């Protein structure tokens, strides 16, 4: 049930998991919880989500607590401000270290406790099968 958009395939889950058990599910399928890198991707994701909440690849990294992507895409703080619900991330209860798509809007993301169970979205690039490019 992977959906295709601009060079990547996406899996919207049918069963909810904690953030980390969602990521392990993605990894078992050669993917990761999704990063979000453009307005058009954010639009594809929140529209497809259809008002349900889904874990995405947002999680804290470093001692400063900077947001990061689990698929190792460098996190662009400046260009991601436009993507959080107003007021977020708010670290409610000093315990919200993972992020989801919550609101069906370009301003969609919420920080939530990593141990909460939600549906989730994996991403993986299309990688053609081709003979070795070394030679
Ligand atoms: O009011 C927003 C607030 O709602 C609940 O408390 C949780 O979803 C928080 O993560 C969120 O920031
Ligand atoms: Ca929050």
């Amino acid at each position: 049930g992977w959906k295709y958009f601009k060079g990547n395939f996406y899996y919207f889950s049918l069963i909810p998991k904690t953030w980390y058990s969602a990521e392990q599910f993605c990894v078992s399928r050669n993917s990761h919880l999704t990063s979000v890198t453009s307005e058009s991707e954010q639009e594809f994701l929140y529209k497809t989500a259809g008002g349900l909440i889904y874990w995405i690849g947002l999680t804290k990294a470093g001692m400063e607590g900077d947001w990061s992507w689990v698929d190792d895409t460098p996190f662009n703080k400046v260009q991601s401000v436009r993507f959080w619900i107003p007021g977020e991330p708010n670290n409610a209860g000093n315990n919200e270290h993972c992020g989801n798509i919550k609101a069906p809007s370009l301003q969609a993301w919420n920080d939530a406790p990593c141990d909460k169970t939600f549906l989730f979205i994996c991403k993986r690039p299309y990688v053609p099968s081709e003979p070795s490019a070394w030679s």
Side-chain angles (χ1 to χ4, degrees):
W2 301 72
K3 311 179 191 285
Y4 178 69
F5 176 74
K6 293 193 183 197
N8 288 296
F9 283 99
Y10 298 79
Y11 177 88
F12 288 71
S13 81
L14 301 182
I15 291 168
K17 285 180 198 289
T18 58
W19 184 96
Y20 185 63
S21 291
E23 175 58 5
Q24 286 191 310
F25 178 96
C26 294
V27 164
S28 80
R29 304 311 200 263
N30 293 312
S31 65
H32 285 288
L33 287 171
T34 193
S35 53
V36 187
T37 64
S38 67
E39 178 177 320
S40 70
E41 190 177 19
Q42 178 84 328
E43 172 186 50
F44 170 76
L45 291 165
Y46 86 72
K47 293 198 161 163
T48 306
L52 295 178
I53 298 172
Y54 290 81
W55 282 132
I56 59 169
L58 281 170
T59 193
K60 291 176 193 169
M63 165 172 256
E64 316 92 340
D66 292 344
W67 286 94
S68 71
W69 293 122
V70 71
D71 75 2
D72 290 330
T73 301
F75 184 83
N76 193 320
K77 182 169 191 189
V78 171
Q79 293 293 78
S80 303
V81 298
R82 66 186 77 182
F83 299 144
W84 291 99
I85 287 160
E88 309 293 344
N90 66 352
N91 199 21
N94 288 328
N95 201 33
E96 298 193 315
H97 314 312
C98 286
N100 58 45
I101 279 171
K102 172 177 167 169
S105 160
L106 279 175
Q107 305 176 316
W109 305 340
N110 177 43
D111 57 342
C114 292
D115 300 314
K116 289 305 126 90
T117 60
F118 293 111
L119 306 178
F120 56 91
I121 300 166
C122 312
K123 178 185 181 172
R124 56 169 179 84
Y126 170 55
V127 175
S129 174
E130 277 147 17
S132 167
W134 291 116
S135 27

